[PDB]
Design a binder for this molecule. Structure first.
Ligand SMILES: CC(=O)N[C@@H](Cc1ccccc1Cl)C(=O)N1CC[C@@H]2C=C[C@H]3CC[C@@H](C(=O)N4CC[C@@H]5C=C[C@H]6CC[C@@H](C(=O)O)N6C(=O)[C@H]54)N3C(=O)[C@H]21
Length: 110
């Protein structure tokens, strides 16, 4: 019942609080295809990203109502979760814009 509403090419990262540095999500360096999925049954949204080369899922995160999405630069956006900060380092400004527009839309309708 999940349907993709966008896809963007980005390096998915998480902030390692213990070592005070960004690290590749899933320990897997390289680019992912990152979607927002809309579950129409319960009007929920999630971020799901899979490595482009090997298809491993490296991020699967809820988008709750009120999520604060920080566009730090034209190609790096980030948001908080209880466990860690997530980051998307986009391949292009246009990838970043298409993803942010889909995120904005999800946040407006939640
Ligand atoms: C008030 C508050 O806690 N605010 C949070 C942000 C926030 C605000 C509102 C809602 C949600 C969130 Cl999430 C916060 O300040 N956080 C999130 C944790 C992040 C960590 C470190 C420092 C290092 C300085 C900055 C940083 O990360 N920045 C600069 C752009 C820069 C661009 C790309 C990424 C790519 C990986 C790394 C690099 O290239 O080496 N890198 C970067 O180096 C990237 N920052 C942050 O950004 C920090």
């Amino acid at each position: 019942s999940e349907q993709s509403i966008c896809q963007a090419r980005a390096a998915v990262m998480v902030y390692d609080d213990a070592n005070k540095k960004w690290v590749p999500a899933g320990g897997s360096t390289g680019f992912s295809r990152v979607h927002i999925y809309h579950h129409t049954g319960n009007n929920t949204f999630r971020v799901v990203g899979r490595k482009i080369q090997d298809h491993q899922v490296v991020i699967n995160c809820a988008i709750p109502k009120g999520l604060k999405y920080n566009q730090a630069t034209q190609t790096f956006h980030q948001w908080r979760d209880a466990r860690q900060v997530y980051g998307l380092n986009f391949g292009s400004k246009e990838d970043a814009n298409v993803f942010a527009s889909a995120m904005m839309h999800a946040l407006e309708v939640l």
